[PDB]
């Protein structure tokens, strides 16, 4: 109704409809600390919110008051909670509220409180029909929005909406193959559908990742996904992966490629390979190359790695 910036906005203390209630001012003590100097409008709305909350008043007026309170501080979890308690008590039209939260989220897409509330309305309504479209829109504003991704994962798991996510992931990866949030979603879909143990799927993924790495050799996301799906399986167990990797070394090298090879050799040594010495030396070398030149920011880590390799594969 009456927007807080309207030229005709009226303070709650001057509304006839609220004349019966005594506002409750905040008590910060005789000598406050971290005291916020609230505007007159903010302190007025919250003085009435405290009065409404204190008497647990479940009215239509208290419901509308919470919209202003949220406008003033959409991070106030007590206000958001009370509004839900009011949505129930007043048997409010939830689709109407969905329209409200849609608009608000578009404004403050990074506010957690806002997504939590949408999640509640979705379980209550048990309707996830609008969800994937809406989130896609939000993700257009920022494809890495943590909260939007979390909500998307919740809707998909709860309502088992796995059918088209891998395609969506393929769309966004084309839009930005460096979007680590999308590489993660890819893993989320696959490990929750076909799983990675299906050697055909695993084969599809490694090949897909290798082509991805070929196009943008310095995109860390792809490198991370590749190692992600094979790390637990034993990197050295894939002889053809190692040969394709070494084949990248010329026109497609990077500290990632070098790092990966160190993993492979690290695994080879764990797996009691033959030519232990030849391998340890190939590892230690790449380690120093990384510490001293190709990945000096991580010199401390690489010195640790090399040191660990020696500590357990020498003499």
């Amino acid at each position: 109704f009456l927007s807080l910036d309207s030229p005709t906005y009226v303070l709650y203390r001057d509304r006839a409809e609220w004349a019966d209630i005594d506002p409750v001012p905040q008590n910060d003590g005789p000598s406050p600390v971290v005291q916020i100097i609230y505007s007159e409008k903010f302190r007025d709305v919250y003085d009435y919110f405290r009065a409404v909350l204190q008497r647990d008043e479940r009215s239509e007026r208290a419901f509308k008051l919470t919209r202003d309170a949220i406008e003033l501080n959409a991070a106030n979890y007590t206000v958001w909670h009370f509004r839900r308690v009011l949505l129930r008590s007043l048997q409010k039209d939830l689709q109407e509220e969905m329209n409200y939260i849609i608009a608000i989220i578009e404004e403050q897409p990074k506010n957690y409180q806002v997504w939590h509330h949408r999640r509640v309305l979705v379980e209550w309504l048990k309707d996830p029909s609008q969800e994937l479209e809406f989130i896609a829109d939000i993700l257009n504003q920022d494809a890495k929005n943590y909260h939007a991704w979390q909500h998307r994962q919740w809707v998909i798991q709860e309502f088992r909406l796995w059918d088209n996510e891998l395609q969506y992931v393929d769309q966004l990866l084309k839009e930005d193959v460096r979007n680590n949030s999308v590489w993660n979603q890819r893993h989320f879909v696959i490990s929750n559908t076909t799983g990675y143990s299906d050697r055909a799927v695993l084969e599809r993924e490694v090949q897909y990742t290798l082509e991805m790495i070929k196009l943008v050799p310095h995109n860390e996301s792809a490198w991370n996904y590749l190692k992600g799906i094979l790390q637990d399986r034993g990197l050295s167990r894939y002889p053809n992966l190692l040969n394709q990797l070494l084949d990248l070394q010329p026109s497609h090298s990077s500290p990632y490629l070098i790092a990966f090879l160190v993993d492979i050799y690290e695994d080879m040594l764990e797996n009691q390979c033959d030519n232990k010495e030849d391998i340890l030396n190939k590892a230690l070398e790449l380690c120093e190359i990384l510490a001293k030149e190709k990945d000096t920011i991580r010199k401390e880590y690489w010195r640790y790695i090399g040191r660990s390799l020696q500590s357990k594969h020498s003499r």
């Binding site: 008590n27 991070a75 979890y77 909670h81 939590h116 993660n184 943008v216």
Partner: protein, 416 residues
């Protein structure tokens, strides 16, 4: 010279492989702007220039601890956080807290405490685990008996129980949701006040361990992208619960270290995202934790003088690009001057300056020696002296418990 100024450092710039996407484009921009800042320090020098503007930081903090502009209206449900952010920054800067504000902080925090346990974002607000963590940390930073005595321990335990879920997780608040951070707030607060019952954290360690994903890092809830803020909370929570081994520490270590930006020198929160001052703590804070973890497992290849990240490069990023002329610290040049970043850039700077493992101690203070900050506990992010002080005090007290839960089972009115 300075790591960031060296000639070869220009080699650390982004190679977009000629494939431009929003990510590379935004990354290049920050690198260009940061380079401009680097150039300035390369260019001019006759007197030492890497200096922590202590003076200006203190003014900002001393003022904020008392009065905030309506720019902070958005943190009206986060007042105990403001108290922690500020008091911790002051503590790190070695500024003592006067008895009068100490008492006023205590009293304010008392007002923030729910009568049914925990602390809310402000007076009369429902309790919530984030402000509960902050409030306890703040009271522990003050560290007086008056401060300790504010916490209703029995009610706090009751409150943690009210949020504890069967699968091991904890709700942020009643009617709220769960995440690794709430698990961390409960473990932090429960251990400091000595209220850990045999079943309080049942299943928690396994719930946190499921948050570690394919990257090696930890998301907020299982399935989510690895994020520095959550990864810190995850590992810190497990250290408190002595269950760090529930995680694959190797993929965790490899993930964090990769989080340090090669050019900028500071840490990003997630892979392929921008650098940011606050992660100087969230991310770098993991290294001392991983160092303890691996060391307890007898790892022989551990350094006896350095954390596994470029301590120097992080300090350079912080000192050169994360300070505001008007006081307070930042996300990055001309970006986000607030009490949160002031607390975390400082907390990260202090982690980067001090190393300690057993008897081994070794500092690395870039810039003027005057830059040394007091050390911070890597689990709780309050002074180690304050951690020891709080725990020793709360261990004088017996863990609370519900007697009705221990007496004999009943079933017949007749036997009354």
């Amino acid at each position: 010279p300075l790591y960031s100024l060296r000639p070869e450092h220009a080699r650390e710039r982004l190679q977009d492989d000629s494939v431009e996407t929003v990510t590379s484009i935004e990354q290049a921009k920050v690198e260009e702007k940061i380079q401009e800042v680097f150039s300035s320090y390369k260019f001019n020098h006759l007197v030492p220039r890497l200096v922590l503007q202590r003076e200006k930081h203190f003014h900002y903090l001393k003022r904020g601890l008392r009065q905030l502009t309506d720019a902070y209206e958005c943190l009206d449900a986060s007042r105990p956080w403001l108290c922690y952010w500020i008091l911790h920054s002051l503590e790190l800067l070695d500024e003592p807290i006067p008895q009068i504000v100490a008492t006023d902080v205590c009293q304010f925090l008392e007002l923030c405490q729910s009568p049914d346990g925990g602390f809310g974002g402000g007076p009369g607000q429902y309790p919530h685990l984030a402000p509960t963590y902050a409030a306890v940390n703040a009271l522990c930073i003050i560290g007086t008996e008056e401060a300790y005595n504010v916490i209703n321990r029995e009610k706090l335990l009751q409150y943690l129980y009210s949020l504890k879920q069967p699968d091991g997780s904890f709700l942020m608040h009643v009617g709220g949701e769960v995440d690794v951070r709430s698990a961390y707030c409960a473990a932090s607060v429960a251990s400091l006040t000595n209220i850990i019952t045999p079943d309080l954290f049942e299943g928690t360690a396994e719930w946190i361990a499921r948050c570690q994903n394919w990257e090696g890092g930890i998301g907020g809830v299982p399935g989510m992208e690895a994020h520095g803020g959550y990864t810190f909370c995850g590992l810190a929570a497990l250290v408190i619960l002595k269950k760090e081994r529930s995680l694959n520490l190797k993929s965790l270590l490899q993930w964090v270290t990769s989080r340090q930006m090669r050019f900028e020198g500071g840490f990003q929160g997630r892979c392929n995202k921008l650098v940011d001052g606050c992660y100087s703590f969230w991310q770098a804070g993991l290294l001392p934790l991983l160092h303890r973890a691996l060391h307890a497992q007898g790892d022989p290849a551990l350094s006896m003088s350095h954390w596994m990240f470029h301590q120097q490069a992080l300090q350079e990023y912080i000192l050169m690009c994360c300070q505001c002329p008007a006081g307070g610290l930042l996300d990055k040049p001309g970006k986000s001057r607030d009490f949160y970043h002031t607390c975390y850039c400082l907390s990260g700077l202090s982690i980067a300056q001090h190393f300690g493992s057993g008897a081994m101690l070794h500092d690395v203070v870039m810039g003027v020696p005057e830059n040394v900050l007091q050390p911070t506990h890597p689990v709780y992010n309050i002074g180690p002296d304050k951690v020891i002080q709080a725990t020793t005090h709360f261990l004088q007290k017996p863990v609370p418990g519900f007697e009705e839960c221990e007496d004999a089972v009943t079933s017949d009115p007749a036997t009354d």
